[PDB]
Amino acid sequence: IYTQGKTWGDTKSGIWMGMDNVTAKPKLDIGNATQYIRYDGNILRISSEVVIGTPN
Amino acid sequence: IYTQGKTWGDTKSGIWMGMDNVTAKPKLDIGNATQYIRYDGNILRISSEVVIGTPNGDIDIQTGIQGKQ
Amino acid sequence: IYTQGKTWGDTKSGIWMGMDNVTAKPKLDIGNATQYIRYDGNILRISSEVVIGTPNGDIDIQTGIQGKQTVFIYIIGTSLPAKPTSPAYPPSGWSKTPPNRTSNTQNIYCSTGTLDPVTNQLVSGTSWSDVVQWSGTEQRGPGMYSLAIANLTAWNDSQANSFFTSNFGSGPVKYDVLTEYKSGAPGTAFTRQWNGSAWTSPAMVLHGDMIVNGTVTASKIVANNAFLSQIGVNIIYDRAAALSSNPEGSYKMKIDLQNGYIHIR
Amino acid sequence: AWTSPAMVLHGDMIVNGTVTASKIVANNAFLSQIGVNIIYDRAAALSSNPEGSYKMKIDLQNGYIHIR
Amino acid sequence: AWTSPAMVLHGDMIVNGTVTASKIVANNAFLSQIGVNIIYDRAAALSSNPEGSYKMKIDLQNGYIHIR
Amino acid sequence: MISNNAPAKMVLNSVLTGYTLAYIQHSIYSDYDVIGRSFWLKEGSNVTRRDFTGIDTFSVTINNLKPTTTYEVQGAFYDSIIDSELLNAQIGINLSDKQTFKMKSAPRITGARCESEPVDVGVGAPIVYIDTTGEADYCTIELKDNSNANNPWVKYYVGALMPTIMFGGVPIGSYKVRISGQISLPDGVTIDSSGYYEYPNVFEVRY
Amino acid sequence: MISNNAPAKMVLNSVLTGYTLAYIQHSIYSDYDVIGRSFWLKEGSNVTRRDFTGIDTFSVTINNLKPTTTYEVQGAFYDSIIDSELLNAQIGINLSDKQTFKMKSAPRITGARCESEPVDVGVGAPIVYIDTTGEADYCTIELKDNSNANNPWVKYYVGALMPTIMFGGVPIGSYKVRISGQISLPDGVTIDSSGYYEYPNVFEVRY
């Protein structure tokens, strides 16, 4: 499932999420070419800074 | 939304995303049995190794860095 | 793509993922109002505490792992000896049990560091303690721990309390942390640190190792060991005095700030 | 100037292994064994020239205590 | 052996609460209060059997300091 | 009249048994001069006295044992007035009651095959079927590509051990399946890991 | 030379509390003439004596205790010399020093409710929001359709007790709700449950 004209390694900002019969590992990519959450089947990569929890 | 024949918290290698009416919480799972990103409304679990940011993410563009002794 | 009614960052429980045409940035929102994983085009927010890695993920499958502690009384000695240098549970020609002595001689022990049963010798580092003459008979440092539960669905304070009062027979100390996982499924696990009374689950848990190319800032840091090239501090108490006694009456302390001196007490 | 960090935790953190970082800043450190070469005052360490520090338990080479 | 960690970061870390770990490694440290059982020299601490070879040791629990 | 009473008889709880390892939770001593603990393993007609001089903890673990062998454990706290020779002679101490336990058996695999996932439409993804026999919990299972002899071993399942184990995410090809179950003990850090029992027969998975 | 010895006063190592069952770890007897161990609870107004035959194990399980009632524990071993009348008098027993512990409280439901989101197309999924006030480590919640005269109680939620509990996937009929808490004794097998508390109100699931 993806926005039109988007690929897991494209420089276009978009969403791409689906299987890969080459490795049978799910792949997820969401964000632009410099701020993204690239989840390879084996390693999860985040570019933009992340906030965990809420203050109080 | 999921790949055919896939269920949350299962050994299959699919993706699952939707509302679990049984517990009335959203659910998520991306990955195989071992390496996965599983999220339940109460708690999130990420089995696979995680990397945040990129090397030289906040490097000065005008000037580089270096070290000497 | 989204559950009906849900919108990005809306109170009602649901999910949302789609484009922001004006900003041309992908957006994602999953979870309730209080707990959620929301990712705009510039920031990723996770309200609910996240656990990364799994217990016993990076263990050797060829050989397990275990820890043990030994304390042996090992001299019929006229004078105080020099502490052993060989890291072997029976040290260099050194007895393992209190032997018999003549009236002139005395007995000296050493609080041997942690022993490794697999190697049957002192683990790397942690040399032998100072030798002290054995007269009559001879709090514990907080540490990390894990436990297995046959069928785990949520954190069990009762199980953890039973664990500590069974193994150590004294209950947990401050800053202790125990992780409980379901037997047959290490993926599902719960971790909590005991401070003051009862257990408080942390906002985040890591099971392997953490590597940071930059700096780290925290209110306080506790670790069983550290190796720092340069350290700058104003005051430094003793661990027992620092954590056990809030008033810091008893101590053996250094004071870099203000007047600098050494106090033995 | 001001800067944005890699990621921020608004609660405590637990790491079952070892944590490595270029440099550490904290208020209270409750450890059990530390290996350090040279130690200065907090302000002196933060200074451009630590030579003006109040105390130094230099250990890598000198191995002597000198109080200024 | 080369070992892949659980977390990798490249910016900076912020923790409002507290961070706990089995052990720590860092080039620099700027602290305010420290409570430690024993203090060693980095060369001795990294080396096996530190108390066999240590430039200066202080045992806060036993109120002892030694310089060779 | 002055005396030094012997430590009370040691009481052992149920023996948690893992292959090549053991866990015994005993009682709390009360005498004022208890300085060590010991246990007399009895395998067949062979007796091994395992002694632990650490009194700090109240749980113990024998590092080395013989796989799949019934044992006998008798434990006892001893005072300072007991010497190595006296302890060896079991003189002047109160020994625990007899207890019988048996060791565990490492997991072993019977078969491996490729099956297509039953689906209502389309090409169902392959799912690997392996039948497992043994004694462990959350046994790990791996695979190795057979194209080359240097291919890495890749973990694919750590779930609970079952008579039949299934999992997905296996690329099409030929693999040699490897299993080595794990079993923990109450102790904080003691984890038991068996050797690798790989399947002699290579199997191939295809759509 | 001949003499008699009273059993050494034991030390209660620890006590784990259940809102109906009490677990105590105590030292081991050291005298041959010991025949049994006894305990003397204190409700704060009436003193209750409890004893358990056999001294095989280091632990005990006191039953039939009033929930939400702090108690004081003191007991020791009594040998064959001690008589029932003398034991009641507690003259020569040389019991252990008292120790005070707080007995936990059974779970209760503060309120019962159910709400669901209106939907443009389709049907809003029923959900149940129920707020508790207990302190059990983990609690199970049952349900029963009250419209029929007699229906079997059915479990629908199993998990940790929380200020607010959310669950769904339940049929449409009006229901009665009972809540029970279960706390695990130090022994893995034994689990202490609670008397089922039932909300007096009866409500239809929000459809």
Author numbering:
A (entry chain g): 414 to 469
B (entry chain f): 414 to 482
C (entry chain e): 414 to 551, 562 to 688
D (entry chain g), E (entry chain f): 621 to 688
F (entry chain f), G (entry chain e): 1 to 207
Mind quoting what the paper says about this structure?
We present the structures of T5 tail tip, determined by cryo–electron microscopy before and after interaction with its E. coli receptor, FhuA, reconstituted into nanodisc. These structures bring out the important conformational changes undergone by T5 tail tip upon infection, which include bending of T5 central fiber on the side of the tail tip, tail anchoring to the membrane, tail tube opening, and formation of a transmembrane channel.
(H) Cryo-EM structure of Tip-FhuA at resolutions ranging from 3.6- to 4.3-Å resolution. Upon RBPpb5 binding to FhuA, the central fiber reorganizes: The three FNIIIs strings dissociate, two strings relocate on one side of BHPpb3, and the third one on the other side. To accommodate for the drastic conformational changes of the FNIII strings induced by the bending of the central fiber, BHPpb3 hdIV-FNIII linker is pulled and, like a zip, disrupts the interaction network between neighboring BHPpb3 monomers and with BHPpb3 plug. The three β-hairpin legs connect BHPpb3 to the nanodisc: Their tip is composed of 233-Leu-Phe-Gly-Leu-236, which would insert into the outer leaflet of the lipid bilayer hydrophobic core. In the crevice opened at the interface between two BHPpb3 subunits, extra densities were identified, in which the 43 C-terminal residues of TMPpb2* could be modeled. At low contour level, aligned with the tail tube lumen, a hole in the nanodisc is observed, strongly suggesting the presence of a channel at this position.
